[PDB]
């Protein structure tokens, strides 16, 4: 029995071993209570404003759109403390952990951004943080690993399975299965078992709320579409949530197409995978024909979650949101274009979203359209990657 519906249509649920169900029910109840609590809301807003730097800017990109009838704005989550939107929801989850009387945080991370985010929130709020990270990811993200440790978190390499994000996800759940009485699991995206998809959307929905107010101020109308990359689905649902009931506003999510969908080396399970049950939820998964879970491939390390949030699968099924994919070369081209024409270095994750906006503009340059791209993070971390390719 739960307070809120754990499903978005057929997708979602609470597919964890029975021993973890009390922890999920406890978290759901704490969340419902926090959402009606003016003191919790004031505390969250204060950290968002005075620690993280909200509200973030909405930047118009006239150099990019010159000569066309596209007007494009970027929502500047690259300017949030930590360099990516993940900071919003780790602060709310840290506060939920304290509300429940927990003193320890467990988190998983792939590219490391979620681990840095979890470590910074835990340092600020006095929580003891341990992070699980696939050993292959530890090897290729030494900078992030060192940032986590400078912030006082313990980083534990995971060598099982493929030694990447999914295996860190498993290990986090194995730990929580034994430590839930003292530790909160600070999950990194809008996926996993209920209530996580719902809590992560609500702790990211200020992205879309601010965007709406900002665009109304600057243009006096809502966007024709809002566009966001989809790794696990958090930045995209945070941008989409406030516009879901605005039927005229398009919601476009962009999964990584890797080397190309036809090559099979991609990370686009929503449109090109198959529904399965893993990580606590029923959702589209990267998996073999026999049901073994597989990795997502992208030039961008952070779009590596091999499934997708159940709310996105639901919005897709009813046709409220549209999902597309962008390849590695398209993302690289968008990264180069933003640097040169606007002086902003975008994360290679966010570059997928910007690449799809550029295609909408270039393919029909005389179509009048007001677009917002969620610039989910900054790309200083990606310059070596981009340098080596080039």
């Amino acid at each position: 029995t739960t307070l809120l519906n754990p499903y978005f249509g057929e997708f979602g649920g609470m597919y964890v071993p029975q021993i973890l169900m009390p922890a999920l029910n406890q978290l759901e109840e704490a969340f419902v209570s926090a959402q009606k609590d003016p003191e919790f809301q004031a505390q969250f807003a204060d950290l968002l404003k005075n620690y993280a730097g909200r509200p973030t800017a909405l930047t118009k990109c006239q150099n990019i759109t010159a000569g066309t009838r596209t007007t494009l704005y970027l929502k500047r989550e690259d300017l949030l403390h930590g360099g990516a939107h993940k900071t919003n929801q780790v602060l709310g989850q840290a506060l939920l952990a304290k509300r429940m009387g927990k003193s320890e945080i467990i988190a998983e991370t792939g590219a490391g951004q979620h681990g840095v985010a979890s470590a910074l929130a835990s340092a600020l709020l006095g929580l003891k943080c341990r992070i699980y990270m696939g050993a292959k990811d530890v090897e290729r993200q030494s900078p992030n690993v060192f940032r986590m440790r400078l912030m006082g978190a313990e980083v534990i390499p995971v060598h099982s399975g493929s030694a990447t994000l999914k295996d860190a996800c498993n290990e986090a759940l194995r730990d929580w299965s034994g430590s839930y009485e003292t530790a909160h699991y600070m999950l990194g995206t809008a996926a996993g078992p209920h209530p996580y998809p719902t809590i992560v959307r609500e702790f990211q929905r200020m992205i879309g709320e601010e965007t709406k107010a900002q665009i109304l101020d600057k243009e006096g109308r809502l966007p024709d579409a809002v566009i966001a990359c989809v790794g696990g689905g958090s930045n995209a649902i945070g941008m989409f949530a406030d516009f879901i009931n605005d039927t005229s506003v398009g919601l476009i999510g962009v999964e990584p197409g890797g080397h190309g969908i036809e090559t099979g080396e991609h990370g686009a399970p929503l449109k090109h995978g198959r529904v399965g049950i893993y990580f606590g939820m029923k959702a589209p998964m990267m998996q073999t024909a026999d049901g073994q879970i597989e990795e997502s491939y992208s030039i961008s390390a952070g779009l590596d979650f091999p499934s997708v949030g159940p709310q996105h699968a639901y919005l897709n099924s009813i046709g409220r949101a549209d999902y597309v994919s962008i390849t590695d070369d398209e993302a690289l081209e968008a990264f180069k274009t933003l640097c040169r024409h606007e002086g902003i270095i975008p994360a290679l994750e966010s570059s997928h979203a910007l690449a799809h906006a550029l295609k909408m503009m270039r393919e029909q340059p005389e179509k009048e359209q007001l677009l917002v791209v969620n610039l989910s993070g900054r790309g200083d971390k990606d310059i070596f990657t981009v340098h080596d390719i080039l």
Binding site: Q18, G161, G276, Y278, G280, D290
Partner: protein
Amino acid sequence: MERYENLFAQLNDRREGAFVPFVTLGDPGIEQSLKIIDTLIDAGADALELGVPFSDPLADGPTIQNANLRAFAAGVTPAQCFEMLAIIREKHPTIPIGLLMYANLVFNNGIDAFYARCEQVGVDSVLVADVPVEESAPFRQAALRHNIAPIFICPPNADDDLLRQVASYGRGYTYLLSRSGVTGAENRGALPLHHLIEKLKEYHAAPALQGFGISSPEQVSAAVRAGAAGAISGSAIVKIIEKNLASPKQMLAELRSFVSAMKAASR
């Protein structure tokens, strides 16, 4: 069929508990796993609990993570597991065979089709480790349509509503967890389980098999004395495989010695 019911009746007539080993099918290869299983039965196993290799076994500690890695190195697939199961049933007509599965392997090609395949090969029960009672409806319904007992875990943090649900929905046996955490022989449960056991009997639940952390004879006799119908041991068995990979003959001898000892403790 009613293999668990026949077993527990027989055992009750001898005032004995069940001893039930777990292994991962195909660890460390198909042929050796078949030999391992025959040895477990010859040495006194009353029933089997068997895993199908999966990419992400989130209820398992390192010992069983490694069994899965070994099975995957051998190329073991679910279809190969089903062929093994058919062969095990053809050799041994009465022993209860239960699967311990992860959800994605059951849901993959259709939940109903999974249970139908289990009935075709002779499996008696299925525990899906990452399906709690709250999500179990399609799994238990499909199990029952195909004469398969759906098994539920009764955790130490179980409340009364959960005990009633477990007792109502489960068949064959109830999986009584020794403790929180994941599988592993290193970590022994020490909580008193007497109350849960009595409550389950009060609610006419399937007989309880205690599992997680059972690695020694005294823990088998303790489980039976507390009122459980038996005990399951997996990591302890699997560790004997892992330590003897280089000597398959010595591996079977040690498995025999251990299962014999654990089974003697249930009498």
